[PDB]
Amino acid sequence: DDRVLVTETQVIRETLWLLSGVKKLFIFQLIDGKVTVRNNIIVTHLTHSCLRSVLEQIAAYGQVVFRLQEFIDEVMGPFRTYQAFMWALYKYFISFKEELAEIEKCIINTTITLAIVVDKLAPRLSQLKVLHKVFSTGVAETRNVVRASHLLNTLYKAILEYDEQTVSLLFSLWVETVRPYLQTVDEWIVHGHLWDGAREFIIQRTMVSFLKPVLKQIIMAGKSMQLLKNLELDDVHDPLLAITFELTLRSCLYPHIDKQYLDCCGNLMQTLKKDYRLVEYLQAMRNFFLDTMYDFYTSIFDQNVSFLNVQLQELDGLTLSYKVPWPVDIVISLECQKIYNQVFLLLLQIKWAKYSLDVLLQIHRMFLLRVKLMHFVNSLHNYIMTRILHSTGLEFQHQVEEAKDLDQLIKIHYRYLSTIHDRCLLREKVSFVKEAIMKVLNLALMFADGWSIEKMESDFKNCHMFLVTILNKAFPHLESLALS
Amino acid sequence: MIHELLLALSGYPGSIFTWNKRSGLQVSQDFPFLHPSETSVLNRLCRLGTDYIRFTEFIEQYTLHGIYLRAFCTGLDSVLQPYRQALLDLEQEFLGDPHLSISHVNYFLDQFQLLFPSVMVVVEQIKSQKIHGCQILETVYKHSCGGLPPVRSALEKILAVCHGVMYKQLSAWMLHGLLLDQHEEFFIKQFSLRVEILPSYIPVRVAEKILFVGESVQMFEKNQEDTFAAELHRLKQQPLFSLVDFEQVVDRIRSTVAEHLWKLMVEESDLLGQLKIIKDFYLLGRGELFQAFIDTAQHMLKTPPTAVTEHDVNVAFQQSAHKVLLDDDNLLPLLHLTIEYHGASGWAALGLSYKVQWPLHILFTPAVLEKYNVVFKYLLSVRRVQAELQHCWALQMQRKHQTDAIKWRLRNHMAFLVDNLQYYLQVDVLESQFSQLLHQINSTRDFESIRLAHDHFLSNLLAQSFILLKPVFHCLNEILDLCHSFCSLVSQNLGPLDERGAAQLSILVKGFSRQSSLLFKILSNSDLAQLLLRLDYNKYYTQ
């Protein structure tokens, strides 16, 4: 078997070339993207086999640097994230190849052999092994939004495992890879629009936990900014590094993204006070129903759909609606009108019975049935209007005046109807409790027209006792009327 | 052949030095160029190479998981560094002089034949017993007390870098309230403590100190932050773990947070006011309120309890607080009486719970707030029987207009003296123990004392009031329900005890007087204060 019998120093220059990132070498001739040592290489010493052993280890390192060079090649020859990743990866080799070319200088111009260049390259062959595992998760994968999210999330996970020179590498490799997101996030905030390419961002107008703990403050600031125009963040994170790594350290980035948010949401609410006002639009809504409406209903006591309109502009129907502009349309939604209409219908029936039994002025036996009834309806009316329709109303106004958000203003509002529809018993338990109050209201209609008498108290004393013996189950706020 | 060997000792086996997966590095067979004797010294030398290969293979494999295993291998390369370096030099000398022989290799590597075979078993114990977590910081320490100086100077380095992990986590927790861990390595896992993983040389005393200084931050949600970071970092530079110094940095941190916590626990959050609320209602401090509540909510509790009585009393208690001309919408809805129903007289299940606020949530746990309830159950009973008993007296004098009816007061007064003065030693164990609890507060600036002074104050009440002492508590209990029968007997009628009442009257005196003297033998530590009052006129002395 013939062999080439290469000299000694030649091998080192080969390895320096291979680790540099070139191809077509007399040694380490790759075949299928996998570098492999030749078979006829031999030195005067090392019995032709140890050489195949020592080269095999360096060959394993060539694979790590050849595959990466193939990756950078397939990017040069608008993803805007891999470009930010390769530029970080490529930036490492330049600071690394200088350490290689420098060694070759001391070869042409001190003795140097194999066992010396390897030990001299220990803090490099260590840092290189990490990349073979970090990049292995960025090559094993089809959509552009899953290939970039899964990559950027692998870094933030791989650093927390390493929490020193290896951490300085991954960190400097991280910042240059999150630069695209940190740009569009800032750009979306101040410029009020999301400028994405190939739907790279996760919000396609499956999530990286990097920015999750503050994500809610982003979207609620982005969309809020877009509704304002119709009426350098990365250069901040880096200076923070100048003045406990990436977990508490990252917890100091958000003050840059949170105070910026606080101005935006505080700006929309500020301009919403006048100029598409809301506080005067909201109060008048709950004012034109729930005086003015006194004369309106009295005309209905003594029909036509146009007759009421001229009256308003001056058994269970009368659907009322309102006109809402666009800046407030999102607050007072369409399904919000019905709830406001719901409580308006029921409220009038109480005003009806209360006014029907009050407008007028065994013969006198009817009066003992008047006070026994006029008081009861008067008691219920004092419960709905005063201790419900004015308690939550007094609290609601004290809450809206501290609105600091587009979203929470909907919640504080939606937490006003869905509770006022519960205290006023209209949602559930209707055929169990509410019907009792409904059927006794028919006594306010029958007794009003007639102006049989003994057969009313037998019914009245029954249904009223039926009312208390049913409501006795008391959920807790019902006791404010249970006294009578 | 020399450069051939110096690679075999590096981790690269060849034709001359074959490699076997079980035995290790060894020479193949005889060779003409080598002397037939030198094959032995090589085989003795290869005992050094087999270690380094099995070392670096384990180091790369990283195998089990955990930071304390990652750091061990990270440090294991540091002690191995002089071996690599001292091998590079052998190339230098041999390159110069062409006459050296293998015997010179044996002289240079003498110490390494002594360092590896001992540190090897340290690795073998790990891979053979699944030593996971902080238990490594003891397994390596139990072998650090060896006799060989180099071995002692080697493992101490590994322990010096392995402590860097704990020192990283320890400082991250004692000042940021969170523990950076995802594999349950730290000895902390409402948090708790771990003992089956806690180090050996670390005492439990400081372990308790750590568990408190951290939870006091996580619950709590300047210059006292950075300076301690420099202290913790300083210990990481120490090449020898000195427990005598580990405590001087922990205790100062402990005293500072405790001093800071005491400031809030008393000054900003008024504990004295809250304790004043507890003494009044739990311990019947405001007895004038409970006599009216008992006066009203009486008939609705002698009947067995049902699902409705729970609300039938909360309104009565509310009717009571206004009936004593006390008006305060604060702390009035915070008191909610409970009825232990469905898991029997109604009084036996009565109780009072307290929805504590946020700051005192740490001082008043459901445990300590439960022992308070037991005192309220018992102290109310004595109050119930006393108020009931005196009403009978309020009727005897009211019954002034039988030679046997006079036996009533001759028993009533006896039942009175034993019971009325029994409510004494109560106003003199409450107003004495409480007066110490309030004094231990305004004395020590530390907060740790309060958690112990208050805890000891509570244990005394259970001990002083004979609640825990079973024999006396099971004899006086018979005296309690005894008066219920007697007082009822006088109230269930308005005439002389003739219709089998006298026949029932003489029943209890045969038991009461027996129960009376039975207690007397029990008393004959703390009973001296009680027995002195009953024995002032020496009536029991003649008994």
From Swiss-Prot, chain A:
Biological processes per GO annotation: cytoplasmic microtubule organization; meiotic cell cycle; microtubule nucleation; mitotic cell cycle; spindle assembly
Tissue: Widely expressed, with highest levels in heart and skeletal muscle and moderate levels in brain.
Any one GO cellular component localisation term in the record: centrosome
Domain of life per record: Eukaryota
Compartment(s) where it occurs, according to its Swiss-Prot or TrEMBL record: Cytoplasm, Cytoskeleton, Microtubule organizing center, Centrosome
GO MF annotation terms: gamma-tubulin binding; microtubule binding
Keywords linked to the UniProt accession: Cytoplasm, Cytoskeleton, Microtubule
Keyword ATP-binding (UniProt): no
Family: Belongs to the TUBGCP family.
The protein's role, per its UniProt record: Component of the gamma-tubulin ring complex (gTuRC) which mediates microtubule nucleation. The gTuRC regulates the minus-end nucleation of alpha-beta tubulin heterodimers that grow into microtubule protafilaments, a critical step in centrosome duplication and spindle formation.
Subunit structure: Component of the gamma-tubulin ring complex (gTuRC) consisting of TUBGCP2, TUBGCP3, TUBGCP4, TUBGCP5 and TUBGCP6 and gamma-tubulin TUBG1 or TUBG2. TUBGCP2, TUBGCP3, TUBGCP4, TUBGCP5 and TUBGCP6 assemble in a 5:5:2:1:1 stoichiometry; each is associated with a gamma-tubulin, thereby arranging 14 gamma-tubulins in a helical manner. Gamma-tubulin at the first position is blocked by TUBGCP3 at the last position, allowing 13 protafilaments to grow into a microtubule.
Name of this chain's protein: Gamma-tubulin complex component 5
Gene label: TUBGCP5
Curated annotation (Swiss-Prot), chain B:
Tissue-wise expression: Ubiquitously expressed.
Record's keyword annotation contains Phosphoprotein: no
Coiled-coil annotated spans: none
Domain of life: Eukaryota
Protein localization: Cytoplasm, Cytoskeleton, Microtubule organizing center, Centrosome
Family recorded in the similarity comment: Belongs to the TUBGCP family.
Protein name: Gamma-tubulin complex component 4
Source organism per UniProt: Homo sapiens
Taxonomic lineage: Eukaryota, Metazoa, Chordata, Craniata, Vertebrata
